[PDB]
């Protein structure tokens, strides 16, 4: 699994691959790992499937639960804290092998400067969190390859479109070097999924646009 996120001017993008493995065996080709958790946040999760789905589902419920009870959404800091606490709650199980780590992407509507209101937050198994300050992040078995790729490509990010292209290419590089991460499947027509978040909120990126990007990357390297 690889999940990537990066900030571009005015927002943030998050993308994830589609593969699951049981040892060496490919056990899934269409897993969705990136979830819109509220109007301005998305969560991508690597690790134990059962734990990942619980996180995304319960977290989205918790966010809206607060909003309905209190009449207002949590501040971004609060959203971070709640995710971290949820992750820490799983520590015991994680030590038994049920380990899953979320990556959080968001757009802070309360931020002073809308150009840089994009937020990326990573989490460790004990509930530790870090607000990323270098522009991008990745989690999962191919996260090192994706970050080494983004390190070289990130200077090309100037808008949502280029941000999306860099994210898909980082996923491509992750799949290229990590057998547990899936590349674009042109035969079946299955591609990584992505969410873009800006001032107008979080939206799913159409498969067609990701397919187009994938084809360009492939043609470019041929």
């Amino acid at each position: 699994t690889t999940i990537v996120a990066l900030k571009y001017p005015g927002g943030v993008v998050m993308a994830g691959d589609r593969r699951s493995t049981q040892g060496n065996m490919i056990s899934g080709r269409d897993v969705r790992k990136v979830y819109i958790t509220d109007d301005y946040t998305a969560t991508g999760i690597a690790g134990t499937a059962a734990v990942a789905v619980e996180f995304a589902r319960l977290y989205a419920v918790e966010l809206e639960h607060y909003e309905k009870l209190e009449g207002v959404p949590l501040t971004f800091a609060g959203k971070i804290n709640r995710l971290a606490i949820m992750v820490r709650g799983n520590l015991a199980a994680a030590m038994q092998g049920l380990l899953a780590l979320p990556l959080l992407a968001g757009y802070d509507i309360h931020a002073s400067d809308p150009q840089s209101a994009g937020r990326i937050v990573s989490f460790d198994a004990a509930g530790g969190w870090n607000i990323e300050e270098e522009g991008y992040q990745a989690v999962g078995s191919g996260s090192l390859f994706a970050k080494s790729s983004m390190k070289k490509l990130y200077s090309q990010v100037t808008d949502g479109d280029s941000g999306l292209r860099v994210a898909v290419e980082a996923l491509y590089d992750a799949a290229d070097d990590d057998s547990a991460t899936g590349g674009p499947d042109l035969v079946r027509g299955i591609f990584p999924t992505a969410v873009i978040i800006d001032a107008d909120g979080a939206v799913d990126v159409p498969e067609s646009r990701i397919a187009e990007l994938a084809r360009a990357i492939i043609e470019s390297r041929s």
Partner: protein
């Protein structure tokens, strides 16, 4: 104990009759909630779930408890089953059971009256549903409108006379504000269950938007 039940029922009845009024009306776009409310932050109308709304009259701390309890119930059910499995009927039913228990076992009855409303899911055709739950757990579904709190008689009639099925938002709002008179932005709390919304139907109508409607 026959006297005791009689007194509890009187305490609640007398308490709600002293509170400000609220109406819920089925309308072309969904359900409209309108309440006499001077407060800007304290609320008597609220979202419960995707397609389900809540309104209350009476003692605030008491109906706010019930509001929170409902939200707790809904979110739990939706998580344990699926979102689509949470319904207004279900919530109304649970309030009936809750208020019934409170009425007969609490130290003091809750001086509240509640309305639970539900609109169709996006792209479906389904008449809105309005349920009214009273202080003793009695429950009733209404076809067109619900009136709660204070002196309801004039408001109900004023409504039974002017109510038109499938009115526009603006027409529904005036009908409601008028029935209530029997009130500017500063003294009204307004919200709708907008069936046209993709998921969360509840939306408040405040400030400038509300003014243009009055």
């Amino acid at each position: 104990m026959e006297q005791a039940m009689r007194e509890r029922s009187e305490l609640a009845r007398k308490g709600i009759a002293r509170a400000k009024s609220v109406v819920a009306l089925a309308y072309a776009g969904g359900v409209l909630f309108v309440a006499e409310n001077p407060s800007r932050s304290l609320q008597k109308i609220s979202e419960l779930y995707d397609r389900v709304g809540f309104a209350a009259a009476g003692k605030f701390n008491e109906f706010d408890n019930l509001r929170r309890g409902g939200i707790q119930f809904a979110d739990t059910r939706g998580y344990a089953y699926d979102r689509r499995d949470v319904t207004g009927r279900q919530l109304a039913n649970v309030y009936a059971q809750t208020l019934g228990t409170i009425f007969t076992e609490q130290a003091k009855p809750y001086e509240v009256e509640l309305c639970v409303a539900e609109v169709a899911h996006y792209g479906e055709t389904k008449r809105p549903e309005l349920y009214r739950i009273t202080y003793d757990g009695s429950i009733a579904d209404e076809p067109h409108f619900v009136v709660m709190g204070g002196t309801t008689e004039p408001i109900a009639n004023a409504l039974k006379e002017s109510y038109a099925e499938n009115a526009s938002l603006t027409d529904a709002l005036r009908i409601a504000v008028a029935a209530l008179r029997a009130l500017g932005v500063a003294s009204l709390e307004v919200a709708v269950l907008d069936a046209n919304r993709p998921r969360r139907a509840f939306r408040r109508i405040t400030g400038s938007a509300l003014q243009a409607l009055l």
